[PDB]
C-alpha cells in the first residue's frame, strides 16, 4: 500500500505541475518592461537613534506614525518619539533573544518574543503610566519568528516548528493551528482585511491560510535554498520573498506560481529583510553586504543603495503614512531615511 500511495502522490504532483505549467501564461518581467525606472533613490540619515547597545533584530512602528517600538539583543524594548527624538518609555525584557516585536494598533500594548517560544503582552498606555506585563502566550515548540496584532484582541504567531497559530487575548488559548510546512517558518505578514495571512519557510515553499478555518489553500515553490523574509503587498494580494540563494522572488496567490526574480552575479549573500512602500512601487531589502538595495518591484533593477550601515542590515519598515524608513542593523543603530 505504501508504494501505491507514493505513486499516487507522484502523479498528483505531476498533475499539479501540468496545471501550473498551463496556467503559466507570462511572467512579471514581460508585462512590466515599459514603465519608467524609479532611478537613484538617494536617501539620507535624517535621524540617528543612538540608544541601543547591541544589534537590532526587530523593530515595528505604531499606528500614530510617531511612536515606534524597537527590540535589540541586549534585552530592551525602547519606545521612541520620532518627532522630538525622545524616548517615551524603555521597557526591559525578560528574554534578550528577541526576534520580533509588535505594536498594538490602539497603542495600549506591545508584544515581544523570540527563542523563548513565548509571546508576551505588556501594558503601554496605562492610567498609572508604568509599563507592566499584562499576560503571556504559550504553546509553540519552536522559536518565535514573527507576531502581529490581529485587530485588538487576537494575535497571529509564527514559529520554527513549521506551524502558525491564532490566539485570543482575553482567555489565553490557542484557538486555531496551521500545519503543512516542512521547514522553519521565518517571516509572517497579515492582510489588510485580517482574513488571510502568508508566510515563507526554509524549504523554498510559501503557503496561504484562512484564519476563520484552519486549512491551507495554496503553495508556491520557486527557490533553491531557505526563504527567510516575507511581506504583504498593500492591495491584499501577492507578496515578496528573499532567500539565502541571493535571489529575491515575487509570488502571487491566484497565479499560484513564481513571477519575478531579483538577482545578480556580484551578490553572493542572500536577502534578510523585505518591506514594501505605501504605493508598492519600491521594494526594499537588506543584505549581508552591509547595504540596503532599493529594487523596483516591477523592473528587477538595483535603483538605489542605502549605504551607511557598517554591519549586516537586519531590520526594515515603513510608516503608516509612508513618511520614513527605519533601518535597524547589526551596527546597533537605527536610522530614519527620508
Amino acid at each position: 500500500e505504501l508504494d501505491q500511495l507514493r505513486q499516487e502522490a507522484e502523479q498528483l504532483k505531476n498533475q499539479i505541475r501540468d496545471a501550473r505549467k498551463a496556467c503559466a501564461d507570462a511572467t512579471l518581467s514581460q508585462i512590466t518592461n515599459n514603465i519608467d525606472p524609479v532611478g537613484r533613490i538617494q536617501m539620507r540619515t535624517r535621524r540617528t537613534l543612538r540608544g541601543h547597545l547591541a544589534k537590532i533584530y526587530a523593530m515595528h512602528w505604531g499606528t500614530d506614525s510617531r511612536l515606534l517600538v524597537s527590540a535589540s539583543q541586549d534585552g530592551k524594548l525602547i519606545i521612541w518619539d520620532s518627532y522630538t527624538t525622545n524616548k517615551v518609555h524603555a521597557i526591559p525584557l525578560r528574554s534578550s533573544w528577541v526576534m520580533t516585536c509588535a505594536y498594538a494598533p490602539s497603542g495600549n500594548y506591545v508584544a515581544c518574543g523570540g527563542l523563548d517560544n513565548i509571546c508576551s503582552i505588556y501594558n503601554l498606555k496605562t492610567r498609572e503610566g508604568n509599563v507592566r506585563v499584562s499576560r503571556e502566550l504559550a504553546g509553540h515548540t519552536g522559536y518565535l519568528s514573527c507576531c502581529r496584532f490581529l485587530d485588538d484582541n487576537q494575535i497571529v504567531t509564527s514559529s520554527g516548528d513549521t506551524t502558525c497559530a491564532l490566539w485570543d487575548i482575553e482567555t489565553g488559548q490557542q484557538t486555531t493551528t496551521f500545519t503543512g510546512h516542512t521547514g522553519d517558518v521565518m517571516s509572517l505578514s497579515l492582510a489588510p482585511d485580517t482574513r488571510l495571512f502568508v508566510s515563507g519557510a526554509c524549504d523554498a515553499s510559501a503557503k496561504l491560510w484562512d484564519v476563520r478555518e484552519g486549512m491551507c489553500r495554496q503553495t508556491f515553490t520557486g527557490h533553491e535554498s531557505d526563504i527567510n523574509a516575507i511581506c504583504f503587498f498593500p492591495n491584499g494580494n501577492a507578496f515578496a520573498t528573499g532567500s539565502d540563494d541571493a535571489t529575491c522572488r515575487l509570488f502571487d496567490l491566484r497565479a499560484d506560481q513564481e513571477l519575478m526574480t531579483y538577482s545578480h552575479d556580484n551578490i553572493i549573500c542572500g536577502i534578510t529583510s523585505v518591506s514594501f512602500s505605501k504605493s508598492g512601487r519600491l521594494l526594499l531589502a537588506g543584505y549581508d553586504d552591509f547595504n540596503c538595495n532599493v529594487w523596483d518591484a516591477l523592473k528587477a533593477d538595483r535603483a538605489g543603495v542605502l549605504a551607511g550601515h557598517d554591519n549586516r542590515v537586519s531590520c526594515l519598515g515603513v510608516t503608516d503614512d509612508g513618511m520614513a524608513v527605519a533601518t535597524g542593523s547589526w551596527d546597533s543603530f537605527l536610522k530614519i531615511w527620508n
Binding site: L2, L5, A9, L12, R20, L28, I31, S279, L298, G322
Partner: protein, 56 residues
C-alpha cells in the same frame, strides 16, 4: 506511520489540485495597477518639503 504520512500528502495534494486557478498575467496587471494608483501619496517616491516633513 509512513502509510499515514503518504495519505496526508496525497489528500493535501488533492485539495491543492482543484483550486480555481486564473492566469498569471491578470495578477501581474493587478500588482502594476495598485503600484501606479498610489504613486503621488508616497513620500519615499516623491520628495516632501521640509515644512511638511517632521524629520527635517
Amino acid at each position: 506511520a509512513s502509510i499515514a504520512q503518504a495519505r496526508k500528502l496525497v489528500e493535501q495534494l488533492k485539495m491543492e489540485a482543484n483550486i480555481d486557478r486564473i492566469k498569471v498575467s491578470k495578477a501581474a496587471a493587478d500588482l502594476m495597477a495598485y503600484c501606479e494608483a498610489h504613486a503621488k501619496e508616497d513620500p519615499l517616491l516623491t520628495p516632501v518639503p521640509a515644512s511638511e516633513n517632521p524629520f527635517r
